[PDB]
Amino acid sequence: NDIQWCFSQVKGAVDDDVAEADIISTVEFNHSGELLATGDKGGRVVIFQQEQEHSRGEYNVYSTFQSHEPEFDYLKSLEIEEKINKIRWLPQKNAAQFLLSTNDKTIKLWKISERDKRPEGYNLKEEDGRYRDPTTVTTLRVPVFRPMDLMVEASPRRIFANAHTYHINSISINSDYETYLSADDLRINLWHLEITDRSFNIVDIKPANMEELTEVITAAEFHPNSCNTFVYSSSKGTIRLCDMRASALCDRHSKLFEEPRSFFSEIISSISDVKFSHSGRYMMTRDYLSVKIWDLNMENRPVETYQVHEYLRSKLCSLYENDCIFDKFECCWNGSDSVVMTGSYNNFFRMFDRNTKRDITLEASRENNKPRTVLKPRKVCARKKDEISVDSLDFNKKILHTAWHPKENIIAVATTNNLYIFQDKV
């Protein structure tokens, strides 16, 4: 019953100069899955729309805009990078589309709307800008709207800035359609989607003296259904679940998820990302080497654990030297929560089937750039035929960001600078 993933599309330049501004930094599907937002280190956001004709239509460019631009914080003598950290779509409220785009410092609410009406008509001039004699104004006429070629316009509606001392690493919308949280390294702020001049600091784990700092917030997320529950992971590998009903300030956690001896244990233990299951009963956390799935009812241990790449446990020394050990990988649930996807090195992304416990490795490479071509499972060992040696792994090729279509078996896998879209073999 394994899904025979087939190459569908690849976007971006083919083995180009790979400028730093061209590196993809986030992939986020829409709530309905029609739109697929992509962010890069250059502050540019590209939105792809699926062809409207279960659906397996190709994704085509829909909108493009400069979400963030480089800035200099003259109050701190710091250059604010324009890299897009997280993109989060808001629930569709009208014909327009809304999403939140955040760099390390500022969150922006962007409205993407289609306009197909052109106001035509003038009194003191022509459509070409040629003015006329004002004395010839005998009868007033009102402009009319003329149909025009469809155009997509992206504009910033609200800017949420000047709230985080440290770098924002997560944004998550609340299920109440009103608020969302933004979590930096040491503080979590609660925002209102229609208010920008003030925010509520629910969580603040900053020590009184920074000399005593021992852990930082790595990720945070609201519960998909409950409006009062959110979980934020720390660099120690512990997830704290906060019930906003207990008190206004969530400094006291309702639950603490953790487990009871390598040299780099302090690093690999850090949780890169935490994702709630669609049902909300389960929670998945990604550390450097493994994926752990936690049942919210059980805190002592995870129900399931999956090893993303065991062959790199022996190479942590090399990874530390080149700083690859600090890569913050991500994890994604499928629509039915039965399969979880996470990325790896050498353009490998792993699929873990929870029901059957099966495990496959797939590669996103241009060599298979033929639509409707089955992806051959990859095996890494260090060696039989067709197996890729561990030494051959290219640690510069990191699949950090991945996204799963909320309903269908369509996954958007983002390499360093190319976005790959794969579909199930119908």
Binding site: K93, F98, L140, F145, R157, Y177, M244, S247, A248
Partner: protein, 581 residues
Amino acid sequence: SLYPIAVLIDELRNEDVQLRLNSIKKLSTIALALGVERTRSELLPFLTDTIYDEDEVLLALAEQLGTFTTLVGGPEYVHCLLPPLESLATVEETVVRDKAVESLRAISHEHSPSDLEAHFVPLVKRLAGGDWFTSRTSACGLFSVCYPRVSSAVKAELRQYFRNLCSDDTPMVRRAAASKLGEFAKVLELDNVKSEIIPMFSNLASDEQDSVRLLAVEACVNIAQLLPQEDLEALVMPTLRQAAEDKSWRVRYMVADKFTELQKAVGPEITKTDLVPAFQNLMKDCEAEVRAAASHKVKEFCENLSADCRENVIMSQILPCIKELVSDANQHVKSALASVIMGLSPILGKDNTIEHLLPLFLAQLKDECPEVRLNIISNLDCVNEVIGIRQLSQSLLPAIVELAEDAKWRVRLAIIEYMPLLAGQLGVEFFDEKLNSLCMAWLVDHVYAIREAATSNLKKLVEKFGKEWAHATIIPKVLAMSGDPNYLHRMTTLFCINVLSEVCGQDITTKHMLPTVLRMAGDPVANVRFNVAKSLQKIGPILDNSTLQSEVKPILEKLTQDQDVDVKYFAQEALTVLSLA
């Protein structure tokens, strides 16, 4: 003639928001020029779905579209204004939707009953049944206006539509329904309220979303005011009781924040049986916000209790809870309680106040937080009526003295504001012996704001203690500062004279104040010298005409020859204002 109008119409397409905003704000002028017929056929279609979507621009348009009934030809063609407002009711921005809903409500009254069933009611059905929850959210605010006038058959349809909104899958819609549930019940028949509003009210009050349940509390108040008092126990109280015991502190906050409104709705009998136990729990709530909200209601809640058991309930059930609040760790809970705690003195009476309230009163004055102490000192009027403030004088003075000497000048500023109020309550006898030194000490404070506040405080004190008291006590000490080595303190003498002369009259200003002002005209510091010119300009009207010519004019003229530009300028201004030159 038409050219100015052509400018406005062309600005509608202008890329500059300011020009577009200005043109839209003048649509009334544009409509008049176009005429009644042209406005319906040309202007309104252009305003239906505007390409521009600026929040301020759309908000301005919504306001204008609500006042076009006459311009579109009166009520006969008022329905032509629906499409422009229907689009605005669907926009993402909340304020624009709210204004659009307000405009729709305003023009709804101008629809005849036939029009409502033909043009307005279908609009509500479209918005209510729309696939975009922005439209459905706006539809909630339109049921109340149209329901009374539509026919019975239409009324049945509207209730069904409102029921669907209360069950909408989107929390945004449900919040809107809960907010408008109270007003929609005020127009429904009492039979339908019991049978149809209550099931919706109960369902919303138990909604999974905390943001929706907390809105049900307000609906509980409105629904209670409609039902008979005997029907509350079965229709309202079961929902209200769980709200006070709700898991979410946000819901409990609303109960505490609207407790007095609930008390006036359920009636005295229910208040004793249900609210009083609930109020105690709120004052003991684990969340500081809930306790602070409950504290504000202590005075109002106790007053409205039935006289048959007001004193007994307060002494036996409310007072013990207040004792814990006085010791509450949270600063804000203590501050909120302090501002209303002394309001219970008239209720309990003199004998009970001394034995029970007074120990808590002393504890508040000893609180470390200045705000708690300031709140107590600001609300001594109620205690004064019941028991003479002289009993509290020995305990207030240490608190006043400590505040008057606080390191933070803003704290010192606050007590100065309350000083004239306290002086009247404590009387002249106590003020002169004890508080007089504090007022003088403020005039020579390092912070200018304190000196400025003290100068104003002197004026207020004289207004109530009379001119004679000021001459004997305040004036002689104020003039002593004229010899202070610091020029800032010397200028304070002129500032004090500026305000004191306003109330001391000629009988005192000329005899005592004026000689000091003229003498200071020779101060070596130029800053003092031109304040004399400004001082004389202000007290000149009070002084008699003979005095001005004899003394003020020669001194002002001499200042006009001063080597400093500022002294010359203000000296010249004084003569011009005083008509001395």
